[PDB]
Nucleic acid binder design. Structure first.
Ligand code: MG
Ligand code: MG
Ligand code: MG
Ligand code: MG
Ligand code: MG
Ligand code: MG
Ligand code: MG
Ligand code: MG
Ligand code: MG
Ligand code: MG
Ligand code: MG
Lengths: 240, 58
RNA sequence: CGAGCUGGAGAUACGCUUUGACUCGGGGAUGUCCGAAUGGGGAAACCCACCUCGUAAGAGGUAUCCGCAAGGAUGGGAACUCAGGGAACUGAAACAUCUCAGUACCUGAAGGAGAAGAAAGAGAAUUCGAUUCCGUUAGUAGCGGCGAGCGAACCCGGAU
RNA sequence: GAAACGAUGACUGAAUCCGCGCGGACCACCGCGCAAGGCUAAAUACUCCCAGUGACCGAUAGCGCAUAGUACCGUGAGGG
RNA sequence: CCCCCGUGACAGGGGGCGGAGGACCGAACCGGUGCCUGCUGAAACAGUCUCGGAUGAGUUGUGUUUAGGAGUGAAAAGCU
RNA sequence: AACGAUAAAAGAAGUGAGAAUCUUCUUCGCCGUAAGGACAAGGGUUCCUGGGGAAGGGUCGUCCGCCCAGGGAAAGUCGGGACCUAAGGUGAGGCCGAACGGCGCAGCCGAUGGACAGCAGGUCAAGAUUCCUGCACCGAUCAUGUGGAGUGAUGGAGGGACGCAUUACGCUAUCCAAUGCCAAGCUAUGGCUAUGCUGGUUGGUACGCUCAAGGGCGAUCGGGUCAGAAAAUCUACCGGUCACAUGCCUCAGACGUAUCGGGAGCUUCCUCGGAAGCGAAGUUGGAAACGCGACGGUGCCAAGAAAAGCUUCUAAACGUUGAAACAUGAUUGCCCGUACCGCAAACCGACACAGGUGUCCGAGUGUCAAUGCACUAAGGCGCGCGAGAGAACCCUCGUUAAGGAACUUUGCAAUCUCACCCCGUAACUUCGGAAGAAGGGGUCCCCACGCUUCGCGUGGGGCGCAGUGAAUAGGCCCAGGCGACUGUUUACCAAAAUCACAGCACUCUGCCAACACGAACAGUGGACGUAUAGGGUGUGACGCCUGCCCGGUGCCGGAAGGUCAAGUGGAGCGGUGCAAGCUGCGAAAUGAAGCCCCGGUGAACGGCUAAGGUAGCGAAAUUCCUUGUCGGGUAAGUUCCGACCUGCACGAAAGGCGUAACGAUCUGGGCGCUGUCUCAACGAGGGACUCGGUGAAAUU
């Protein structure tokens, strides 16, 4: 609703269709969001209004800082229009206040979490996404990510109190196609409808299937896709 | 292609033999009792325009 | 050069020429606009500028890449040269190594030619004396699913 | 292949003239050579162009063209 | 949204008013069902009639991007 | 054979060597949400004038879009550039790459969008928001005057800046009516004598104490610097002080006065026909936008470009003795487009071709409405062969005795039905629907009376065989198969029971995400997203549900051991030399991922040996035998329905069973109606046939 960026549709990369499907949609404008919040430490802001943002599954709030300058911040479950919120280490474990994990007590439910002290939020940004604080380790804190993964995150990384807004994506039933069209392209096109030429499933004389593979090569159900990477060590217990 | 078609080039004799009835018949001409220039029977003489008296101009 | 010329053009008219036209040989001076194109833009041949000198007409400059600067490169060439990259049909009466072939093609640099060139060599006479080319050696030696098939070099004779 | 020698993309890594490479695994001997710096005419290849010639053609031949990359076909490259 | 009644375990039921819809009928427009005609065509895919959609997953201009084992595809190996 | 739509043509006059075809005249007929008119694209001189008449033109040409010559195209305000940015292109520096090259921040190019000053008439043979007349406006440089000190960026901020549907008030464009006005005449066939007939009936600008819907707006003092890199008087945040209706600022348009313009016609001259001069009226009433007032109102989710000009601010910097702003006169006015065709004979289709082609305007009457349909204005056409004939046969039609599906693969085809109003309306249901269900009645004219009309209601009377009197205009129903559903597809034999679908599941992915494009440690898509998100696969609304079998395959999980690569490691063997050496091959043991092995996993590949089918369905889109068997319907039923179970060979997300509604689906039945048929006939048109003109083809 206020001074934002222009979002342009595009589903093909440097030229060719990379991420399959994706195509329709009512056209949108990008809302600039303050994920980091770091430079606004010590300064308090008032929630002007909560808003609609078709770029995110969660609602967005408008902050009016004591210095004048306004910033669109993520809207948490509970935050009311006309509620005070402050950033910095010296902050309450109350809704909207942005503070790092060391000052965050054990068990406290948070959202919009960074990965490196800086850059900005990169975890629990979707609707109803919550991060459980399991405990402090060293200069690191063990946390439970929305999925259930237990990542070692350094206590130096910022966060926002409470879970995220936009209730629940359930009474959101879509309904009939076209709904899905006024977002992104004719979806999941069955490789079984395809041809030997097009996709491994394709061919035969009726309805079938015989090997269980995706578009290109691989295998679709159950096959670990992570690499033998560095960040593995900063993570304990994956599955679901 | 073209469903019914000829089977052989129709010979010079045969082809010509067919035209034996294409023979144009020359008009049975009579001379006008007046203006005296030929005219076709039951019609007006072209030259004067007479047909007992004068009907047509010039 | 020595009487004609006014292009093909066969075309009438105005003219020009022994103060030597015309044509032929050789230098110059002009040379719009595009095009490496080079002020900037561009759908080539068109748009829009700025700096300088200039009375306006008009004259010159403004691309990058090297080095102080003089000065050098940008692009273009029929084939021929060398370098980076490098097929398949085909033959093997099938095909896979092998063959086609380092052939075709692409690309880079370049010249009237290039490339190669002054033995850590050839080699078995303690012979030879930079390179290229031709003859020959010789279908030899040898390579090879030792299959199809591929195939040197020293010696000697010349071009230089 | 018994596969030397050259070449070098990767890891290494020397002798310096009673020193080094070479001579078809490798060794001894015997013999031939001085790498890791550059330059270098001429004989050779080609023919856009030029001139001369021909048991070359003479208008369905000869270049595609007695002249035209034109007319014509194709968005095009291209073809003609 | 405003008025009206009803409490057996019940729901809403009526009026007003509003102005929803991959709602209906149907031109433009987009499409191509069935027959016939056409079948050296008017036409290298059409004609008359009939028929499907017709506020949507809609139609359409201009500009621009993706191509040869490559593209594109509400998926026929379709289109390029 | 053909001469390119079945929208006709006819006669008269002219010209000319020659005329169905060219010209003129008077009729006819055809289109009129077009078959008129205006752009765009594209074409390129096709436009006009004057000539021509080989070829082109499906015939003929005296003619033309054809051949020749000459002409015509005029812009400060219209489109475009000297302005701006989108997708995309490009891109010094910077990132990658055997090459050539690929990427990329700023910037720059790029209209399809933003911005921006001119109206009304006149008129060449052919141009007109361009020329010409009338009266405007825009910026720029200077001149005289006003004013008397700021001006204000390459930076800030404000503003430009944006959806979809529905809709209230006023309005014009614009259209209709009249015994309103104005102008010309006349009319006779029977009448009318005007209260008939025909035509016209206001456009630009300036001024007003005139009417006016609608629309737009708050002003100012201060504080915090912690926000706009910094500054700012500007902008934002918080506070204090006058903010209801009122109130400011705007007038879309209407009116009045003037003025320039036009206006039906009228008047002479006329060189076969145009030119110059003149000029009447301007009313009352009804309708009316998709245009305007205008950035209105409301509702909605799918949440709706950017940049410049522009308005506000200070930094710099020049100057306050010549500021900006205002006013009036002079001056200034660049480049390209502009003819002509442009739903078509000038464009793409080889054709003067029955196709294709984006935007705008598109009148009247009748008709619920309308861009529908019939007739018709303006305007434009009769489609570049023609004339006779009136056989077969062919196409496109009209009627048809009795019969009415007997036709037939099949009611294929064609009838029937048809609008608006009123009554009435089933099973079944997802409570919306089914439903236009089915069935029935009405409908014209006139007079009276009642009301809300553009009309309607009641009452009475008339006329015809018939009253949506012509045109546009659903036939319906019972049951089943499949798919839920709108949708989508085989350009050019398949529209469907295929694909998509909302909904369900299995699964992978922790963010330089999996995954994808890619020379590449580039760059990018996924995503300026972050597990209520993204990839992949299967199934396919909804309802009830989804059994058993982990032996083989695959994925996920374990390690006690077997296996296993280069490399580390060299026991031992051997070559040569007198010799030290220099050399060829070289075990053991150790050495990762994999594979053997164990365990799990089925909305994994699968099965009905690892197990033998849980419901539910079953002679089925599945059934061989087979026209199974009995029943139904029929006069008679290889299909159809219903039971049955002996499932050659159903069965649970290659989903099982069922389902209201949906269907250009597919099957069976009934009503209706009918040339589908007994069984054909007659009638029309266009070919076929005949003359004159032009004159192909496969084939041989
Ligand atoms: Mg001859
Ligand atoms: Mg040539
Ligand atoms: Mg219809
Ligand atoms: Mg229908
Ligand atoms: Mg870019
Ligand atoms: Mg005839
Ligand atoms: Mg006769
Ligand atoms: Mg059944
Ligand atoms: Mg369907
Ligand atoms: Mg459908
Ligand atoms: Mg004839």
């Amino acid at each position: 609703l206020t001074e934002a960026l222009p979002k342009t549709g595009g589903r093909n990369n440097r030229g060719r269709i990379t991420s399959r499907f994706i195509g329709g949609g009512h056209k949108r404008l990008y809302r600039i969001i303050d994920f980091k919040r770091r430079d606004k430490s010590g300064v308090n802001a008032k929630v002007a209004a909560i808003e609609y943002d078709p770029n995110r599954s969660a609602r967005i709030a408008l902050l009016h800082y004591a210095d004048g300058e306004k910033r669109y911040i993520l809207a948490p479950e509970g935050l009311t229009v006309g509620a005070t919120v402050n950033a910095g280490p010296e902050a309450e474990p109350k809704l909207g206040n942005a503070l790092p994990l060391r000052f965050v007590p054990v068990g406290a439910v948070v959202h919009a979490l960074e990965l490196v002290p800086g850059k900005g939020a990169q975890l629990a940004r979707s609707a109803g996404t919550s991060v459980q604080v399991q405990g402090k380790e060293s200069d690191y804190v063990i946390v439970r990510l929305p999925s259930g993964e237990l990542r070692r995150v350094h206590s130096e990384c910022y966060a926002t109190i409470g879970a995220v807004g936009n209730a629940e994506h359930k009474n959101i039933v879509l309904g009939k196609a076209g709904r899905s069209r006024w977002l992104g392209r004719k979806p999941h096109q069955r490789g079984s409808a395809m041809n030997p030429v097009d996709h491994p499933h394709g061919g035969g004389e009726g309805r079938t299937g015989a090997g269980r593979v995706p578009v290109t090569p691989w295998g679709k159900p159950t096959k670990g896709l992570k690499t033998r990477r560095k960040r593995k060590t900063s993570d304990r217990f994956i599955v679901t | 292609a073209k469903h019914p078609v000829p089977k052989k080039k129709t010979s010079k004799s045969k082809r010509d033999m067919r035209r034996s009835h294409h023979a144009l018949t020359a008009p049975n001409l009579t001379e006008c009792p007046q203006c005296h220039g030929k005219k076709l029977s039951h019609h007006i003489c072209p030259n004067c325009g007479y047909y007992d008296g004068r009907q047509v101009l010039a």
